[PDB]
Structure 1
Amino acid sequence: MKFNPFVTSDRSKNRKRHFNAPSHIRRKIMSSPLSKELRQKYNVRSMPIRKDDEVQVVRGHYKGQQIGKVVQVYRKKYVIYIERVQREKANGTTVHVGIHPSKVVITRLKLDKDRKKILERKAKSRQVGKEKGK
């Protein structure tokens, strides 16, 4: 149960903050879990999604064992687009269907210097937390 008096548990306040968070909070919010192999390798559970990571779709009409590369991340709509998930409209042109990152798992990451810095920081903090828990 929350005991900090300076953080709110009000439903309307939380929803307002969620729906008007700025883009650099949207990046934090749209994070998705790593695969089992990546989790065991990096000792990290979740990672904010980037432009060209690939994904397994876990829930929804498009769940399956297809590795799909993300094409772009629409933070305004809280959505990512995957190069394989898509549907054709009336005229026949094909448009991407939005998938929320929370229903998404990374197969392997795009290892940029900032990405590996973030991974090492997360792993170090988790390991020191576990060592304190010892």
Structure 2
Amino acid sequence: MKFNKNVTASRRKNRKAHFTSIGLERTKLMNAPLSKDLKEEYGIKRIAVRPGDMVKVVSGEFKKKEGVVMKVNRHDIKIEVEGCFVQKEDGKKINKGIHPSNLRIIKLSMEKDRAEIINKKVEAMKSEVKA
């Protein structure tokens, strides 16, 4: 049960809040679980998927496959994974997008600011965990 009356439980309001999200709230939509080993290598339980990271598909047509993230579509919430595609009548191949939550991370791309992003989150935990 919910006892805070400032938070809404309306279906109409929850749905609008989802689809009209922007900025950091949009980034929260692209989160995926880490594998059991990585959850010992790092403190975090889940992270936003980025290009170059390595993922196992755990639901759908392409179940059991593994591959590298090629692109991240923020407007239509989908991820393109290397080697997951369909062939047209022409023989031409189109990558099919997968929803973030159907993936699981196997190796992290550590290019750019990723190491600082991870550090910032670990500290935020401990700050309140140790109190």
Question: TM-score when scaled to structure 2?
Answer: 0.88
Map residues 12-51 of structure 1 onto 2, 5 A cutoff: 12-51=12-51
Distance 1:113 1:44 in 2: 18
Question: Is 1:57 the counterpart of 2:57 in the alignment?
Answer: yes
CA RMSD of aligned residues (A): 1.7
Greater helix proportion: 1
Q: For each residue in 1:67-104, what CA deviation from the matched residue of structure 2 results, as whole angstroms up to 9, or x when unmatched? A: 31111011111000001111112211100111001111
Assess if the C-alpha contact under 8 Å between 1:23 and 1:75 holds in 2.
Answer: no
Structure 1 runs of 4+ off > 6 angstroms?
none
Distance 1:117 1:3 in 2: 37
| Number of residue pairs aligned between Structure 1 and Structure 2 | 131
Q: Amino acid of the residue matched to residue 50 of structure 2?
A: R
Q: For each residue in 1:12-63, what CA deviation from the matched residue of structure 2 results, as whole angstroms up to 9, or x when unmatched? A: 1111111111254221111101111111110110001112211100111111
Name structure 1 gaps, 5 residues minimum. none
Aligned equivalent of 1:114: 113
Q: Amino acid of the residue matched to residue 79 of structure 2?
A: I
Question: TM-score when scaled to structure 1?
Answer: 0.86
Question: Is 1:76 the counterpart of 2:75 in the alignment?
Answer: yes
